């Protein structure tokens, strides 16, 4: 309950993950990739044949979901039912399925405790959509990392090409656009910056610049 927390909310592909890892390292604080949980759940639904369009069927899945995260030894390691799925949850599908699953209010609430349990001394950087607005309301440090949707798409495309996957800009743009709209239009706990959240727009800023500003702001408020 009583422990500092830095929330980093923002749309898809805004670089929250990186920014979260970089700050966790610079502060030797714990990390929480909330998206990973939603993605893990969606992967459980697929394996256990649970209808992703059914709130009733997802709830029992959510409350009894056996997940597990291991310390970022250079990377994150997601474990479902004792099986490293770290790569499988990083596909487009799952990502689409996590959005879908994420829309049901009853589901989110059934996951509330698991996320809040990451709040431990000395600190916790929390990456998600509603960390600063629902999950940890009283966070002393709230950042809303964002960009234009065109930029985030270009970055995503360039990242895919690095790994050698075919790409299309138009398509990718429509992929995230849909994703955000869903997470933004959602009647319960939608994407939206907390009033006291610092809006970080990284459109023209390099990666180091983002970290630089994020850390400057954090250290200031946390003394
Ligand atoms: N705190 C969060 C994190 C994620 N999501 C949902 C909407 C995102 O589309 C999806 C995957 O998020 P991420 O790409 O950050 O893994 O899960 C959410 O509703 N709340």
From Swiss-Prot:
Indicate where this protein is primarily found. Answer: cytoplasm
Alphabetic keyword roster? ATP-binding, Cytoplasm, Kinase, Nucleotide-binding, Transferase
The UniProt entry's GO CC annotations, sorted and at most eight, read: cytosol
Could you tell me what reaction this enzyme catalyses?
CMP + ATP = CDP + ADP; dCMP + ATP = dCDP + ADP
Q: Which GO terms describe its biological process?
A: nucleobase-containing small molecule interconversion; pyrimidine nucleotide metabolic process; response to X-ray
Q: Which Gene3D superfamilies match?
A: P-loop containing nucleotide triphosphate hydrolases (3.40.50.300)
Annotated positions binding ATP: 10-18
Q: Name the enzyme's class.
A: transferase
TM region(s), chain numbering: none
What subcellular compartments does it reside in?
A: Cytoplasm
* EC number in record: 2.7.4.25
Identify a single GO molecular function assigned to this protein: dCMP kinase activity
Q: Which NCBIfam families match?
A: cmk (TIGR00017)
- Please explain the role this protein plays, according to its UniProt record: ATP, dATP, and GTP are equally effective as phosphate donors. CMP and dCMP are the best phosphate acceptors.
Against HAMAP family, the record matches this protein to:
Cytidyl_kinase_type1 (MF_00238)
What family does this chain come from, according to its entry?
Answer: Belongs to the cytidylate kinase family. Type 1 subfamily.
Protein name (record): Cytidylate kinase
What organism does the record attribute this protein to?
A: Escherichia coli (strain K12)
